[PDB]
Design a binder for this molecule. Structure first.
Ligand SMILES: O=C(O)CC[C@]1(C(=O)O)N[C@H](C(=O)O)Cc2c1[nH]c1ccccc21
Ligand SMILES: O=C(O)CC[C@]1(C(=O)O)N[C@H](C(=O)O)Cc2c1[nH]c1ccccc21
Lengths: 302, 308
């Protein structure tokens, strides 16, 4: 079964609908009135920030539940030490249900597998809350721009053809359809958990720091190894990336990116459909920055 | 010390701005992080992640005090949590932080070796977190997003540790704010949270930068030069806290916190002491200048806490 069933009913609802907490924060209707001197953007910066970093903490704690080197109780000690300062603040800043369930994950787990299910459901709960928070934060406010002269100055063969799994990526209301190959031999365990989620329809958002890249919070939590990773900057156009640590997102790189980090490789959009990604990216950039007009991503198998 | 070079950098950065913070707020970070030629999105990530990496670093420092967890187990949780935090900060304006983050997790022989690394790194990140909080642009929301004044009055309308203990054990101190030129005297409650008060008093005297609370309300915190794993048996709800209250939040940056007005936060924080009632009326002026200092002015206000 599932250790926290009420979360699962919420997780499925939140891939479709805006979470109530994301609205009350973006509408400034949080009960305790967070935010100094009659404003709520300072509370908004924290509410968006913590929930992303809290989610990343939860995943690395969930990763250690797979580890038998660290005992079950010592892991609870590590959780009960790290969780309260994150959960108590977020409950004050329009995440009360999230605060309540963090205490249940800390409650003594008879089996390590139970604790793994508590962390797995909760990490998915926070990461969907994080997904909408990345969308509705007012990134358009940043007056602070690079000089035009500064911006102006700036694995597919490896593998087996039989393991290439055909998938389609469809973005609406734009209507752009592209097909892609999922490499199931490079990261076999990772791809198996992403394939199981297909078909999934999730919201599409743009990278605020990474460059010309888009991601979407897919409905899975993968503790699977990542043997084949690729530098984000070294990636080709049409690259399908899956970043488990940043929220189990499905990442598409439709242009040159600045970030130096190494991210796991899921697959690549066919080169003939690579030209279509550039039109979607601009719309996804505007939706995250300015419009807040939802662009939904549908990934399906062929 | 395990990292003596960093202790020179911690002492240097108390007075002066770190080089990493300046290049982020001026948009001179090397790889030009951001999307479509703007460095505010990277700024929002740099400031926030270093804040949450610092809080994670302290709880790892507090994890070393517990002997139920082995060092190999403790190193493993640092080897699992840190990489996603260290590597990005190295990309987003904190390259040296990633250098010492790798050195903290190297196989340690003793608990004191790991605790000294975590204690030094945490304070180094807590000063970097301090300067990122002062210069960050919080005025952007005041122009666009504001609570209504009438709904504020209603939220206050709908809403003793000072009595506890021996008044003889309290230790007087002095907080001096420059360039405002305002002095108040305060008593530190050594009975309630003794090990904490000892750990703070040993740092006296110190002169540090003073900033405001962006979310908590009418409160101002100053990053003091210590990392305290001391027990906190007496804590108080920040919304219930009185005016002139001195608090020390070991988890949110080891800061000296002065409440000079209404605060809405429900979290409980250890009680350091209280400004004497005769000198409480001087706090209203300082916080108004401290608000503008962090909210708008970005003009340094300094705090010198000394023993009397
Ligand atoms: O893989 C890529 O190119 C994107 C990498 C990334 C992601 O969420 O996956 N981008 C996000 C952004 O700045 O917009 C933030 C972010 C990413 N890793 C991170 C690792 C640590 C902290 C933050 C991030
Ligand atoms: O203790 C106080 O007076 C206020 C409490 C607090 C602090 O400890 O600094 N305020 C800061 C703010 O919101 O601006 C940030 C902050 C505090 N707790 C926190 C817990 C989790 C995350 C952030 C914070």
């Amino acid at each position: 079964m599932s250790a926290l069933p009420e979360l699962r009913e919420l997780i499925a609802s939140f891939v479709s609908e805006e979470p109530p907490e994301i609205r009350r924060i973006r509408t400034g209707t949080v009960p305790d009135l967070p935010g100094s001197y009659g404003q709520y953007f300072t509370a908004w910066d924290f509410s968006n920030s913590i929930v992303r970093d809290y989610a990343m903490n939860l995943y690395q704690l969930t990763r250690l539940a797979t580890d038998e080197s660290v005992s079950v109780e010592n892991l609870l000690t590590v959780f009960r030490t790290l969780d309260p300062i994150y959960s108590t603040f977020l409950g004050y800043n329009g995440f009360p249900v999230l605060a309540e369930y963090a205490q249940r994950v800390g409650q003594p787990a008879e089996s390590r597998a139970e604790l793994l299910d508590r962390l797995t459901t909760f990490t998915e709960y926070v990461n969907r809350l994080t997904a909408w928070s990345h969308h509705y934060f007012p990134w358009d406010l940043g007056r602070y721009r690079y000089a035009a002269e500064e911006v102006a100055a700036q694995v597919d063969s490896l593998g087996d053809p039989s393991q290439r799994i055909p998938v389609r990526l469809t973005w609406q209301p734009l209507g752009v359809q592209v097909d892609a190959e999922i490499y199931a031999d490079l990261n076999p365990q990772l791809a198996t958990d992403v394939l199981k989620a297909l078909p999934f329809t999730v919201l599409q958002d743009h990278a605020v720091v990474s460059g010309e890249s888009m991601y979407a919070w897919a409905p899975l939590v993968s503790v699977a190894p990542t043997p084949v990773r690729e530098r984000i900057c070294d990636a080709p156009v049409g690259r399908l990336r899956f970043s488990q640590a940043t929220g189990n997102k499905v990442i598409v790189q439709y242009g040159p990116t600045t970030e130096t980090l190494s991210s796991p490789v899921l697959g690549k959009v066919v080169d003939s459909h690579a030209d279509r990604l550039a039109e979607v990216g601009k719309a996804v950039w505007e939706s995250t920055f300015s419009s807040k007009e939802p662009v939904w991503l549908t990934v399906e198998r062929l």
